[PDB]
């Protein structure tokens, strides 16, 4: 599947840097999907999150954060993992499907800086699109990182195109997994595989990925 092509390339890019692939369940609880990420129950990015809930605790995950939280609790730094998997949101348009794939990275060490975030992701984008392309880092907000950023790639039509989100891990997130933010730091990032696959191979309709027409899939052998 073209999304598998994308996930495999990205796993090989970061695998050479010592990043371990980690996977987890797609149904999670509100702790591993919100609370552990510094998202309290009254936080806006939770009720207004297009989330699929089964009850007040069980949900279809909106991110692959559960495996990252569990890994940090089970070992001290250094941490170097990437976490691919399916995630779920309620929207459904030409550029949105209720299910899609997310690749999330995490590294935690002694002197991890924002300069390392830029250099690593700039290396990644240059390898993924195989050109010395124009990128930019842009201020943003996530409850689980500070400083937070989104990175854009210059679109072929002259406009900037949001490609991924990133930031330095919030000290609250490190604290509640038992990591001292005064000693250790780290950055994380997240990106949608459908989006990157469309930009990489020229796919114009995101719904083609899940219609699974053999004439669409056979183009990616």
């Amino acid at each position: 599947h073209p999304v598998t092509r994308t996930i495999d390339r990205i796993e090989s890019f970061f695998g050479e840097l010592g990043f371990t692939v980690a996977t987890g369940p797609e149904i999670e609880d509100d702790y591993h999907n919100f609370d552990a990420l510094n998202i309290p129950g009254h936080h806006p990015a939770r009720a207004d999150h297009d989330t699929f809930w089964f009850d007040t605790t069980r949900l279809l995950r909106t991110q692959t954060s559960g495996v990252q939280i569990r890994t940090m609790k089970a070992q001290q730094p250094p941490i170097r993992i990437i976490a691919p998997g399916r995630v779920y949101r309620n929207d459904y348009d030409q550029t949105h499907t209720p299910m899609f794939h997310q690749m999330e990275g995490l590294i935690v060490d002694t002197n991890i800086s924002f300069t390392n975030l830029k250099g690593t992701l700039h290396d990644f984008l240059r390898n993924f699109f195989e050109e010395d392309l124009q990128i930019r880092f842009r201020p943003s907000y996530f409850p689980f990182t500070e400083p937070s950023a989104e990175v854009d790639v210059m679109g072929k039509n002259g406009k900037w195109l949001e490609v991924l989100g990133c930031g330095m891990v919030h000290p609250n997130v490190l604290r509640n997994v038992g990591i001292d933010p005064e000693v250790y730091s780290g950055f994380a990032f997240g990106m949608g595989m459908e989006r990157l696959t469309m930009l990489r191979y020229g796919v114009t309709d995101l719904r083609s990925f899940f219609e699974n027409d053999l004439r669409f899939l056979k183009q990616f052998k």
């Binding site: 010592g18 250094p78 390392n116 690593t120 201020p139 950023a149 990925f209 219609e211 699974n212 027409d213």
Partner: protein
């Protein structure tokens, strides 16, 4: 959040165009979602006056009009708008003008009378959806002036996404303050002078919940004209921020919300029984909201009430009774600061989402109420008339939130960012943002301004320094870390290695949705209760899949409906089976499943058309299982499955554990799913075969081997693999290979019986064998098939 660029430029006007300003706002952290023009594209429309107005002599509901546009002589215009009358200042599209839609204005006659242009509505100019009548301009409108200049129609509305941290950017002042910092410009602020009271009217205001409301400001205005029209300049600023004009009192309160970010409300003072009580609601209180519906409130919800009844939901929505109506003459202006934690969640509980609730639950400036009250008071009396009383200030200094004092260390700043920003630049950035900064040895002590609700800890100041300094001004640096190897296990079998083998056997990977249609899954897995979504995107995507067969079988039908009968696909993914012993009561196992149908090969000059059968898929499955090196310990036992042909279905066992299923889709299930023909599915529990055998070198005999073929006739219902397994087990270390090469039943063998032709290969590691010991061993093997099975032939 929508706002007018020209309105923002009244506060801060950097010498740069709209595209760059919008890019600057996006680079501040307020990503622009769109930039839209304020009006349509046109030219040749100017300000005019209706000098003479008379009945059209040949059309009942038309008027003939003399219009002054500052030219050599007056124009003859025909107008049919109901509001057309003498003395009106109007927008005149003169001859030669082009209106939106390439609508050229030509001199023409309308029902016999000459018309040298037309009087325009907002809809005809593409300004709004108002087509009830022609535009009415202020009485002092400059005749002859381009309405694009007079109405400032060369303007854009900018829509931005405001993340919940930037609570200060939900008003003109907050967006402009951030733009000014990024440009190192000062902020130009309107002169808001307090309105002196000319009467002594008040009313009692007591707060019973000072934690939820640390500051409530009431003010009475006596004798207002609620029917007074909103001036055109306020209607335009409201509209260019996405808010349409309703009535003058709501319009002024919406204006101060847009300008200062402060929500405000107006009560009918004559409908307030006693006074104002800012209190928690009682458990089960009933309030009829302004939209006519009733709300049953909980005791954790703040309400504005009087001495008898509840009047509104504090900082969320107004009630039906106490609001301003047509008969209102005296109003009580509310301007309060509500504690964000006391407001958050209450609007969503009752399906509400208002401009006030959005701002209060994120945080409005607690040092803003007085300035916003004086702004609304002057704007209200300048529009609706009346007299203002004194401001009623109920402020609780104990619960009023305090500005945070934060210490920013040089060590933390350089470590987190990795780039040294000069000391003078750090303290300059923090002060332009509004922080009181005192410098120390490698440290800054900063007091956050009152409007920032995202400045509590050190990292918040790191982001502020970094985002204003410029993310892209920070260089790239590779990570420094230890080169430590991970822990490897040669016994791991990779899923990607299995996907590759399936590709090399003619299988295409597909990915299907994890929630499926329970109507069709109940056909494949009847009786098995699935985990349902209470709020699904649709009922056809409301059941978490119990297997991968629902998605795979929908995929072949999809492709077969598009002229492709032959489909051979697989998928890896989780199944969701309700399990009380599993975490969260639902067991999520990673599965590997697939399906084949149609002919074995595509049309080929040397291969004949033949439909796929059970042993084709089983052969592919044995290739997968052989990657584990444990194929000797795999069993295919016939076993019942409602989705499968009872005579061509098998459960797959590995070391006495059922790891999956395989078989032909049951013909009635094939009918219900509208499958074109014979269809074969499988599914495997992945973790049960994610382990493989690590090789261990065994000695090879340098002595030749011998082959002896036997033909054994057994019962038709005896599985041939058990016979092969008996020859391999009962035989000692002499026989090293057992293989089946023919299965006969017909003319020569009794009915219900079959002949199995088996080849036995014998060899020893130390010596060579001769006919004596050889024939004695095949005789030993065939005698083992005498009691457990049947004789030979």
């Amino acid at each position: 959040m929508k706002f007018s660029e020209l309105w923002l430029r009244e506060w801060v006007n950097p010498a740069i165009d709209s595209d760059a300003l919008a890019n600057q706002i996006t680079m501040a952290g307020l990503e622009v979602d769109g930039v839209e023009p304020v009006a349509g594209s046109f030219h040749g429309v100017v300000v005019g006056e209706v000098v003479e107005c008379a009945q059209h002599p040949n059309a009942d509901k038309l008027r003939v009009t003399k219009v002054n546009v500052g030219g050599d002589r007056l124009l003859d215009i025909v107008c049919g708008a109901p509001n057309c009358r003498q003395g009106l200042r109007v927008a005149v599209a003169t001859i030669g003008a082009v209106l939106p839609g390439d609508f050229k204005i030509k001199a023409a006659k309308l029902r016999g009378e000459p018309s040298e242009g037309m009087l325009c509505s907002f809809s005809e100019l593409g300004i709004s959806d108002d087509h009830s009548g022609i535009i009415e301009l202020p009485a002092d409108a400059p005749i002859g002036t381009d309405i694009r200049e007079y109405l400032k129609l060369d303007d854009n509305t900018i829509e931005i996404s405001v993340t919940p941290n930037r609570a200060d950017c939900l008003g003109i002042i907050g967006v402009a303050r951030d733009v000014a910092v990024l440009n190192q410009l000062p902020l130009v602020q309107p002169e808001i002078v307090p309105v002196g009271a000319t009467i002594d009217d008040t009313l009692p205001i007591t707060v019973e919940a000072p934690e939820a409301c640390p500051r409530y400001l009431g003010r009475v205005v006596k004798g207002i004209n609620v029917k007074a029209p909103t001036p055109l300049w306020m209607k335009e600023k409201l509209r260019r921020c996405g808010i349409r004009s309703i009535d003058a009192v709501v319009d002024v309160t919406n204006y101060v919300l847009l300008e200062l970010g402060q929500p405000m409300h107006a009560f009918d003072k004559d409908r307030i029984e006693g006074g104002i009580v800012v209190r928690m609601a009682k458990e089960g209180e009933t309030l009829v909201l302004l939209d006519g519906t009733e709300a049953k409130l909980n005791a954790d919800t703040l309400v504005i009430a009087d001495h008898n009844k509840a009047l509104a939901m504090g900082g969320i929505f107004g009630g039906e009774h106490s609001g301003v109506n047509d008969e209102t003459q005296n109003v009580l202006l509310e301007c309060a600061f509500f504690s964000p934690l006391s407001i958050t969640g209450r609007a969503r509980r009752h399906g509400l989402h208002t401009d006030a609730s959005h701002r209060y639950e994120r945080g409005v400036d607690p040092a803003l109420q007085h300035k916003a009250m004086e702004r609304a008071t002057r704007l209200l009396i300048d529009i609706c008339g009346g007299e203002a009383g004194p401001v009623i200030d109920i402020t609780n200094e104990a619960t009023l939130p305090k500005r945070a004092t934060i210490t920013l260390r040089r060590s933390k700043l350089d470590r987190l960012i990795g780039h040294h920003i000069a000391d003078e630049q750090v303290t300059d950035i923090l002060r332009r943002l509004g922080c009181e900064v005192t410098e120390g040895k490698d440290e800054w002590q900063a007091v956050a301004p009152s409007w920032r609700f995202d400045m509590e800890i050190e990292e918040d100041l790191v982001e502020e320094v970094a985002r204003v300094y410029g993310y892209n001004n920070i260089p790239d640096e590779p990570v420094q870390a230890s080169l430590i190897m991970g822990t490897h296990r040669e016994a791991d079998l990779s899923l990607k290695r299995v996907k590759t083998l399936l590709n090399d056997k003619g299988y295409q990977e597909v990915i299907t949705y994890s929630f499926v249609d329970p109507k069709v899954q109940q056909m494949i897995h009847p009786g098995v209760e699935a985990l349902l979504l209470p709020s699904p995107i649709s009922v056809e995507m409301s059941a978490m899949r119990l297997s991968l067969w629902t998605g795979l079988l929908a995929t072949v039908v999809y492709n077969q409906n598009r002229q492709q009968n032959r489909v051979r696909i697989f998928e890896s993914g989780l199944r969701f089976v309700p399990d009380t012993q599993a975490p969260l009561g639902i067991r999520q196992d990673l599965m590997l499943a697939g399906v084949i149908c149609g002919n074995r090969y595509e049309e080929h000059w040397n291969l004949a058309k033949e439909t796929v059968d059970f042993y084709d898929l089983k052969g592919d499955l044995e290739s997968v299982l052989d990657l584990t090196g444990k194929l000797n310990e795999v069993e295919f036992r016939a076993e019942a499955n409602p989705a499968l042909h009872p005579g061509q279905s098998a459960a797959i066992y590995l070391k006495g554990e059922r790891i999956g299923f395989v078989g032909v889709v049951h013909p009635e299930l094939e009918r219900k799913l509208d499958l074109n023909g014979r269809t074969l599915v499988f599914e495997l529990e992945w973790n049960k075969l994610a382990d493989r055998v690590v090789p261990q070198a065994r000695e090879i005999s340098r002595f030749p081997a011998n082959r002896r073929d036997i033909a054994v006739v057994v019962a038709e219902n005896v599985p041939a693999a058990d016979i092969l397994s008996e020859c391999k087990k009962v035989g000692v270390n002499q026989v090293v290979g057992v293989n089946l090469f023919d299965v006969y039943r017909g003319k020569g063998v009794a009915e219900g019986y079959k002949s199995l032709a088996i080849s036995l290969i014998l060899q020893d590691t130390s010596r060579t064998l001769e006919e004596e010991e050889i024939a004695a061993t095949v005789a030993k093997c065939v005698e083992a098939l005498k009691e457990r099975f049947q004789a030979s032939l």
